[PDB]
Amino acid sequence: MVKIRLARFGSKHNPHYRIVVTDARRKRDGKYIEKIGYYDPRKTTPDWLKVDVERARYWLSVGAQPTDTARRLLRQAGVFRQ
Amino acid sequence: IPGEGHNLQEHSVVLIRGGRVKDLPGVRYHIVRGVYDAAGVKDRKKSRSKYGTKKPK
Amino acid sequence: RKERVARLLRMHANHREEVEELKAGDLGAVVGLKETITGDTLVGEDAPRVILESIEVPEPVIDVAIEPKTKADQEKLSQALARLAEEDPTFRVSTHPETGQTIISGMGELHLEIIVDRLKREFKVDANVGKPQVAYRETITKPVDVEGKFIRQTGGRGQYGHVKIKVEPLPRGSGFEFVNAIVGGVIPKEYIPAVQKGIEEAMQSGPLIGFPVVDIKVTLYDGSYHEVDSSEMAFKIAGSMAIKEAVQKGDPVILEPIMRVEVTTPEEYMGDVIGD
Amino acid sequence: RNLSALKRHRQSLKRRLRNKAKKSAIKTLSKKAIQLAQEGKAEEALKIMRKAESLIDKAAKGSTLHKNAAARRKSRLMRKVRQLLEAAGAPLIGGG
Amino acid sequence: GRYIGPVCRLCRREGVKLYLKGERCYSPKCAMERRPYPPGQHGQKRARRPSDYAVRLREKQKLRRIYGISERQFRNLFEEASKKKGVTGSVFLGLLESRLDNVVYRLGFAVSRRQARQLVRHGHITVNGRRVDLPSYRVRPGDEIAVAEKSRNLELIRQNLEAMKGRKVGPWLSLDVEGMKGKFLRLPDREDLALPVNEQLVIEFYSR
RNA sequence: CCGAGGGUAGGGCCCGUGACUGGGGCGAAGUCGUAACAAGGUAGCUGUACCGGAAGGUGCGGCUGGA
RNA sequence: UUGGAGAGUUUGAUCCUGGCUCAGGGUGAACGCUGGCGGCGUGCCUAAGACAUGCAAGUCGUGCGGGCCGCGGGUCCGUGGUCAGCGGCGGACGGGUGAGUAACGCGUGGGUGACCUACCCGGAAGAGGGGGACAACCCGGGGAAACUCGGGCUAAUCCCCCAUGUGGACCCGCCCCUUGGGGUGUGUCCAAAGGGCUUUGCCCGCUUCCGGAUGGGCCCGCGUCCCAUCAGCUAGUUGGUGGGGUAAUGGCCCACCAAGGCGACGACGGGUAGCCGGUCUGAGAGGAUGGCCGGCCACAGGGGCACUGAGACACGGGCCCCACUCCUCGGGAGGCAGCAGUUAGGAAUCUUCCGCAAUGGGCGCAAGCCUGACGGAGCGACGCCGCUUGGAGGAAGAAGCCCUUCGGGGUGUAAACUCCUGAACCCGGGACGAAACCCCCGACGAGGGGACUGACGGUACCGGGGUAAUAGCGCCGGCCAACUCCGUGCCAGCAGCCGCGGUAAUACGGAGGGCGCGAGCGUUACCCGGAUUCACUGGGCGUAAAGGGCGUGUAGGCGGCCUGGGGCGUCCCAUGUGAAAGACCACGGCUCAACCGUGGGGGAGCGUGGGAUACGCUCAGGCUAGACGG
Ligand code: SF4
Ligand SMILES: [Mg+2]
Ligand SMILES: [Mg+2]
Ligand SMILES: [Mg+2]
Ligand SMILES: [Mg+2]
Ligand SMILES: [Mg+2]
Ligand SMILES: [Mg+2]
Ligand SMILES: [Mg+2]
Ligand SMILES: [Mg+2]
Ligand SMILES: [Mg+2]
Ligand SMILES: [Mg+2]
Ligand SMILES: [Mg+2]
Ligand SMILES: [Mg+2]
Ligand SMILES: [Mg+2]
Ligand SMILES: [Mg+2]
Ligand SMILES: [Mg+2]
Ligand SMILES: [Mg+2]
Ligand SMILES: [Mg+2]
Ligand SMILES: [Mg+2]
Ligand SMILES: [Mg+2]
Ligand SMILES: [Mg+2]
Ligand SMILES: [Mg+2]
Ligand SMILES: [Mg+2]
Ligand SMILES: [Mg+2]
Ligand SMILES: [Mg+2]
Ligand SMILES: [Mg+2]
Ligand SMILES: [Mg+2]
Ligand SMILES: [Mg+2]
Ligand SMILES: [Mg+2]
Ligand SMILES: [Mg+2]
Ligand SMILES: [Mg+2]
Ligand SMILES: [Mg+2]
Ligand SMILES: [Mg+2]
Ligand SMILES: [Mg+2]
Ligand SMILES: [Mg+2]
Ligand SMILES: [Mg+2]
Ligand SMILES: [Mg+2]
Ligand SMILES: [Mg+2]
Ligand SMILES: [Mg+2]
Ligand SMILES: [Mg+2]
Ligand SMILES: [Mg+2]
Ligand SMILES: [Mg+2]
Ligand SMILES: [Mg+2]
Ligand SMILES: [Mg+2]
Ligand SMILES: [Mg+2]
Ligand SMILES: [Mg+2]
Ligand SMILES: [Mg+2]
Ligand SMILES: [Mg+2]
Ligand SMILES: [Mg+2]
Ligand SMILES: [Mg+2]
Ligand SMILES: [Mg+2]
Ligand SMILES: [Mg+2]
Ligand SMILES: [Mg+2]
Ligand SMILES: [Mg+2]
Ligand SMILES: [Mg+2]
Ligand SMILES: [Mg+2]
Ligand SMILES: [Mg+2]
Ligand SMILES: [Mg+2]
Ligand SMILES: [Mg+2]
Ligand SMILES: [Mg+2]
Ligand SMILES: [Mg+2]
Ligand SMILES: [Mg+2]
Ligand SMILES: [Mg+2]
Ligand SMILES: [Mg+2]
Ligand SMILES: [Mg+2]
Ligand SMILES: [Mg+2]
Ligand SMILES: [Mg+2]
Ligand SMILES: [Mg+2]
Ligand SMILES: [Mg+2]
Ligand SMILES: [Mg+2]
Ligand SMILES: [Mg+2]
Ligand SMILES: [Mg+2]
Ligand SMILES: [Mg+2]
Ligand SMILES: [Mg+2]
Ligand SMILES: [Mg+2]
Ligand SMILES: [Mg+2]
Ligand SMILES: [Mg+2]
Ligand SMILES: [Mg+2]
Ligand SMILES: [Mg+2]
Ligand SMILES: [Mg+2]
Ligand SMILES: [Mg+2]
Ligand SMILES: [Mg+2]
Ligand SMILES: [Mg+2]
Ligand SMILES: [Mg+2]
Ligand SMILES: [Mg+2]
Ligand SMILES: [Mg+2]
Ligand SMILES: [Mg+2]
Ligand SMILES: [Mg+2]
Ligand SMILES: [Mg+2]
Ligand SMILES: [Mg+2]
Ligand SMILES: [Mg+2]
Ligand SMILES: [Mg+2]
Ligand SMILES: [Mg+2]
Ligand SMILES: [Mg+2]
Ligand SMILES: [Mg+2]
Ligand SMILES: [Mg+2]
Ligand SMILES: [Mg+2]
Ligand SMILES: [Mg+2]
Ligand SMILES: [Mg+2]
Ligand SMILES: [Mg+2]
Ligand SMILES: [Mg+2]
Ligand SMILES: [Mg+2]
Ligand SMILES: [Mg+2]
């Protein structure tokens, strides 16, 4: 089923994922449906996380599944806040 | 076979590189000195890299 | 070249055993080298790149001396051979230390019959030869125990070197052995290198026919010194006298070179051959 | 030298079996109904074409047939029995 | 690494004092003021007309040799200036000048660029509060270039700051001594800097 | 029924190799003549034909890049 | 308008034509000499040859029944392990390779009224009744093994029947639509399954149907290499009616009927090649290329085939033939183009390493299990970037060595020598990457609170102490930057092209000196460049290579003056598409840089809509200067 996932970019000891919407069956760093944010887990910049929170709400709405630590980033930037 | 004096003979195992010799029509290759059963030139000093010769003392 | 000792084995009578290491003085089968052949020397990556005496010994057997005749072209003979000391490394061009001539060693009567011939009919070489093949050696028959004194304290200017060695006969072929049995420092640590420079040099000429003395063991066990007088050139010549005198002492004689000879004859003349 | 891939095989055989069997009966009855329409034999053809109708869709419940194929299989059985009976009517009972 | 050799010969070849040695450059023990001819067996031999190529070649080695910079890193900088906007000559010198080991020079913390190199390498400098030991560091306009205070109590820095009390530093620079810091105010204009190099020639050397 | 492929038989293309034979290129100092370049000592070239150790010559016609 | 250098070589000399050669940039490179540190990349181009050994795909006791080991005692039962079995989902993804393929294969843009899509998400309705089978297990043959054979018991979310029919399916008729799209009526046909806990209530499942999302199938236009010394090809061949098959169109397959279909706009054949994003070069136009990374394709020893299934005609599933190899007489066994590794071939190409900590994937309520994907580490100057081998002072200038007109010149501030800094090493501390899942509060939601876990790694980095501490390679006639002595005497040798060497060689060999690069420098091989030397940009043909021996004419190319219709080309605006990465510009993160992130700028090309009408096209009408006729 279609998914919201971290698609690793960057370099060695330089993670910079690309929180992304994609078919479960892909390669991790493979063609995705749409990009809807990023993540620099090492917080090396003022903004180590952005999310088109509009879209994550769309994708979620039609069955997209967040990963166990993709909700974490979706939560923290309040996609679920009522 | 480039250099002054060699050690090649029948059954010498050898490595060839491109490059003709203008004077010997029909010759179109050179033996890489210093590889396989091709020795470097004894007592060579200048351009030793091109002749298979290692650095002296 | 670098190589990758992957696994390490021990062959038993009925199976192979994989070990995790192989201590020195032991031996076994390493799996993983690709470009290594027999006689090659292997050392650790971070380790002094020595070459163990693996693969060795020739030896040249016929001694023919070539006098450079006349005289301002001696350098082309010494350069002809630098073309021949690489095309054919079986032979040796060596200057006799005393009498001072260049002597073309070799591998038989015929080997110098081609080199001294090609030398002339291709390079001209203003030079001529005799010459024999008088290429014997020298060794002792019994263990000798002597001294090696060299003292000149008649003016203050240096010259004291004391050496006492045990020179025994070695089994024929083993070459030359040298052990340093100095107990304490009755001779200094720095005088040990160049006291072998007097022994090894005094073996190059002999006591009966003046030919290289081979196949003996030399145990240096004693010797005294003077602090002021002892120079390194006074410990070299004390080992030379001692050895030229030691070799001379306990029964030395002439070891001649033997040939393994394969004569390929028609059978009609076999007896003419054999008897002769 | 292993697996539950072999379990899959042991399993796929019983499935295949159970599938082949339904499929047989389908064809047999379908053919049989059509034959009985060709001479029609009106009452009986439909009676039979019904058992076929029934076995076709029942097959399409499992992994046997695709819903579209059973739909396909069904269309053709009907248009055959009917266009057949065409040569001499009396089409009672029911399946029209 | 760097040229790391005899340097007086460099200058004699160039036929022009490059100031590469520090204090002796101004002394009359300098080699150029003793022998203003090129090094080796043939220097006092009457020169023959240089080729257009020779000229560009020499003019470039000049600029190169001044900054003590690898032909690799040089070329790299030069290429970047060609890609960069507007004038190449200026931007090249500019980019040449923005080198940390060179900023440290015109701020006279050291006498020769070689000396400044080691100064940068050994930890003794600091850009903007943090320590920076990379002689290539591109100093950008607006930064703070100090001796790191953990080695301000040091004989050689003292002696060179001592000699830098009231000398005007180029217009693009500001040196507060005692505090031993500095600031890269702006990047140099062309006319703003003299060096015995016709810039246009280096450009033409790479256009061959 | 079709069906991997096996077999039988006959063809097409390609590659390598072959007694011997054809001419081709190259190769510091071979043998014979001297066809061409000066009207080159018979102007030259030419398509063709026949001839002749060889270059070549001769017929017929053509060209001037000849007189 | 950020972009464009040429040189040597035909002659006695000239100008021209013309080939040859060089300098530049590039590479999955390799070979010589040489080699200190680190980072990110990257590393079988050949035999899609053959492979030893280990690992690369499983998971659910919250679907079911079981045998053995325990833990409370009354041979009992509960329980949780555990091993297979039945059942379910996965195993069609992920990972490898480029052999085949000149094709709807790929690229780009469209069509599907001709179609599928498990899990995930929305909306509707349902879960009632009965029956049944096979493994495990108990019994019995054969084997040196693979293992299998037969007789009987049994559970379920396994299998079947009956019923319900929200609904869906098929035939026939009608209504709208227009290729098989939505609707309606009568006939007929079709659903289901339980488990759990804290148990009058939620949780995970099941059933039919409708929509969404995602992923696909098939079709069509246009683009995609060399040979015409391959010129004609075609019998399922082209079309049609009927039928089979499929999720679905179709000659996809069959039967018949028709006699078609394709081709100089290059069919057929032969050769070569996976294609693309991109990569390299280039002023551009162009050329060359497809390794790494992303997308599609194809293939899984050579072949054929189907089964299961939402999906495969399935790399680590099945069957059969072949080749090869293997274990000990019936047979069996194997499939590294997964990860490492061996062997062969080759100029050449890596560790049988570490970890699931993270990211992603599979199953699972969850704890969790698995993951050679992946995250790391190792080796290789393969590549790129960074850094070191010291800094300042130090003589009209030591020694040695080179040159000399014998005065002197050169190496050269170079060294020594003084002082200063302090790569290495040594101690001390020591990470970011890791906050979720889970637990508690709330309501198992929103929100808050708490805990656990790091392969790399005692590494980066930070603190303190701290030693002067690798340099090599090419080249010095001209092109082309760098000159003298000796040796040698058409020898020995150099050589990229012109050419050097025949006794005074800046061209060979050494030396001293010099120039150029520098942990590299050179060589060979290949690509683009210079080559306006295939010329679209941007060339030529009297004598340099080049006008067909000359007509006539087919196709094709091109085409006078005026007016109007259409708008095909051409032009213009809008809109969709032109993935990501890359390249570019700006900003930032690793001490810099390489490398890496964020943001921007977009264009060619096609789809659609809208517009213009000069020129080109077409249609109509008119002319007489071209052309033809009297
Ligand atoms: S002294 Fe300074 S300036 Fe004079 S030559 Fe030597 S380095 Fe150049
Ligand atoms: Mg040999
Ligand atoms: Mg060999
Ligand atoms: Mg040379
Ligand atoms: Mg039957
Ligand atoms: Mg099926
Ligand atoms: Mg079905
Ligand atoms: Mg300190
Ligand atoms: Mg350029
Ligand atoms: Mg057949
Ligand atoms: Mg056949
Ligand atoms: Mg067969
Ligand atoms: Mg004549
Ligand atoms: Mg004539
Ligand atoms: Mg004549
Ligand atoms: Mg004439
Ligand atoms: Mg004639
Ligand atoms: Mg005759
Ligand atoms: Mg005649
Ligand atoms: Mg005539
Ligand atoms: Mg004339
Ligand atoms: Mg020219
Ligand atoms: Mg010439
Ligand atoms: Mg000429
Ligand atoms: Mg000439
Ligand atoms: Mg030319
Ligand atoms: Mg390969
Ligand atoms: Mg390649
Ligand atoms: Mg195996
Ligand atoms: Mg089990
Ligand atoms: Mg499956
Ligand atoms: Mg391929
Ligand atoms: Mg083809
Ligand atoms: Mg096509
Ligand atoms: Mg298409
Ligand atoms: Mg039962
Ligand atoms: Mg029913
Ligand atoms: Mg037919
Ligand atoms: Mg049909
Ligand atoms: Mg049909
Ligand atoms: Mg067909
Ligand atoms: Mg017919
Ligand atoms: Mg082929
Ligand atoms: Mg291929
Ligand atoms: Mg051009
Ligand atoms: Mg790829
Ligand atoms: Mg195949
Ligand atoms: Mg196969
Ligand atoms: Mg294979
Ligand atoms: Mg097979
Ligand atoms: Mg399934
Ligand atoms: Mg397949
Ligand atoms: Mg599989
Ligand atoms: Mg298979
Ligand atoms: Mg496999
Ligand atoms: Mg492998
Ligand atoms: Mg080999
Ligand atoms: Mg690797
Ligand atoms: Mg390997
Ligand atoms: Mg994991
Ligand atoms: Mg995980
Ligand atoms: Mg592992
Ligand atoms: Mg590391
Ligand atoms: Mg490195
Ligand atoms: Mg190397
Ligand atoms: Mg002087
Ligand atoms: Mg001197
Ligand atoms: Mg002097
Ligand atoms: Mg110095
Ligand atoms: Mg942490
Ligand atoms: Mg609660
Ligand atoms: Mg430590
Ligand atoms: Mg420190
Ligand atoms: Mg100190
Ligand atoms: Mg020093
Ligand atoms: Mg060079
Ligand atoms: Mg050059
Ligand atoms: Mg020059
Ligand atoms: Mg002289
Ligand atoms: Mg000679
Ligand atoms: Mg001469
Ligand atoms: Mg000379
Ligand atoms: Mg020379
Ligand atoms: Mg030269
Ligand atoms: Mg470097
Ligand atoms: Mg070229
Ligand atoms: Mg150029
Ligand atoms: Mg250029
Ligand atoms: Mg071109
Ligand atoms: Mg050409
Ligand atoms: Mg043109
Ligand atoms: Mg031309
Ligand atoms: Mg002509
Ligand atoms: Mg002509
Ligand atoms: Mg004509
Ligand atoms: Mg026409
Ligand atoms: Mg017109
Ligand atoms: Mg026309
Ligand atoms: Mg239009
Ligand atoms: Mg893009
Ligand atoms: Mg920065
Ligand atoms: Mg971007
Ligand atoms: Mg008209």
XYZ file of C-alpha atoms (C1' of nucleotides) and ligand atoms in Angstrom, chain G residues 162-165 189-192, ligand 37:
9
model
C -28.876 -24.841 2.519
C -30.773 -19.779 3.694
C -30.645 -14.287 3.771
C -29.639 -10.684 -1.108
C -27.223 -17.330 -10.480
C -23.764 -15.739 -6.177
C -21.758 -14.035 0.033
C -19.351 -15.234 4.888
Mg -26.928 -19.759 -2.170
